[PDB]
Structure formats: C-alpha cells, structure tokens
Amino acid sequence: GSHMVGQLSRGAIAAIMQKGDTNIKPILQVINIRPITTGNSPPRYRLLMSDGLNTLSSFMLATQLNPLVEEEQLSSNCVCQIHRFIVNTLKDGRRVVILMELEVLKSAEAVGVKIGNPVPYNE
Ligand SMILES: Cc1cccc(-n2nc(C(=O)O)cc2-c2ccccc2)c1
Ligand SMILES: Cc1cccc(-n2nc(C(=O)O)cc2-c2ccccc2)c1
C-alpha cells in the first residue's frame, strides 16, 4: 500500500549494528542475494538487505534456510520478517549477521521495487 517505506523496520539496521539487540523481529527488504565462495561445503548466501533508511550487505543465511533461495520465494525485492538472528564478529572486526529464522511477508513479485531510497550503513 501507500507509504511503502512504512512497511519496513526503519532504524533496525542501525539497531542491530550499534546496539546488537536480538530481541527485535525486524521487517526488512531483500535487495540482493548472492552465493559466496565456498567449495566442498554447502553453498552460503549473502544478502543485501534494507530497512528503508539503510542497506547492509553483512547478512548471511543460515544454511538451513538455503531452500528458501533455491526453491521458494526468497529473492530481490521480497519483504521478510527476521524471527531469529545472531551477530558474529570476524577476527578482523567485521560483523556478520546470520539469519536463522525468517518469514517472507511479501513475495518479490508482489513488491517489485526497492522501497524508499536506503543508503549504505557505514560499518
Ligand atoms: C563481513 C561479511 C559479512 C557477510 C558476508 C561476508 N562475505 N562475503 C563473501 C564473499 O565471497 O562475497 C565472503 C564473506 C565472508 C564471511 C565470513 C567470513 C569470511 C568471509 C563478509
Ligand atoms: C566465528 C564466526 C564468525 C563469523 C561467521 C561465523 N559463521 N556462523 C555461521 C552460522 O551459520 O551459524 C556461519 C559462519 C561462517 C563461517 C565461515 C565463513 C562464513 C560464515 C562464525
């Protein structure tokens, strides 16, 4: 409906990256998905997601959610609610947000566009 950016949890990306609170169940839009280089292990998918204000490319799907990308409705433009996630930190200090449980609220085809004008989160 109208006010599309209101469909997303504006501020959730900053909340995740600055507060590290995991009790939230934010609604985010998938902007892009791509495999990361693995080899000799199940594929892993990285997501560029948006909360309407910011985008962040630090998301990775838990492997248990791979079928959503491979078989069902998880692709660019879909709107999802994250029901469970954890933040992990690499040795170099970069954070990786692992999505453990997510629900597709609106399919890519039902949304069809990048909502709002989100800008990259700097961190
Ligand atoms: C920090 C971050 C967040 C999300 C994805 C990535 N990432 N992207 C790629 C890739 O090949 O594109 C590889 C990684 C990676 C993840 C964990 C450890 C080492 C590398 C990195
Ligand atoms: C210690 C640490 C730091 C960052 C990410 C993780 N991590 N957690 C999961 C998971 O699915 O739970 C998967 C990874 C991962 C491991 C190697 C490369 C890319 C991602 C673990």
Spacing, Cα 9 to ligand 1 middle (Å): 24
Tell which one of 46, 87, 97 to mutate to probe ligand 1, the residue whose CB is within 8 A of the most ligand atoms.
46
Q: What is the distance between the alpha carbons of residues 63 and 12, in angstroms, rounded to a whole number?
A: 23
Identify how the structure was determined. Answer: X-ray
| Three-state secondary structure call for residue 19 | helix
Q: How is 35-94 classified by DSSP, letter by letter?
A: EE--SSS--EEEEEEE-SSEEEEEEEE-GGGHHHHHTSS-STT-EEEEEEEEEEE-TTS-
Tokens 């995991």 correspond to 22
Q: Going by CATH, does the domain composed of 1-123 fall within 2.40.50.140? A: yes
* Ligand closest to CA 99: 2
- How many C-beta atoms surround the C-beta of residue 16 within 10 A? 26
Which residues precede chain breaks (C–N over 2.5 Å) in the chain?
none
Q: What is the distance between the alpha carbons of residues 109 and 35, in angstroms, rounded to a whole number?
A: 21
| Helix (H) or strand (E) segment spanning residue 32 | strand 27-36
Which pair of structure tokens corresponds to residue 27?
């609604």
Pocket of ligand 2 contains residue 98 by CB under 6 Å: yes
Half-sphere exposure of 119 (CA within 13 A, CB side): 1
Q: What is the resolution of this structure in A?
A: 1.5
Q: What is the distance between the alpha carbons of residues 17 and 95, in angstroms, rounded to a whole number?
A: 8
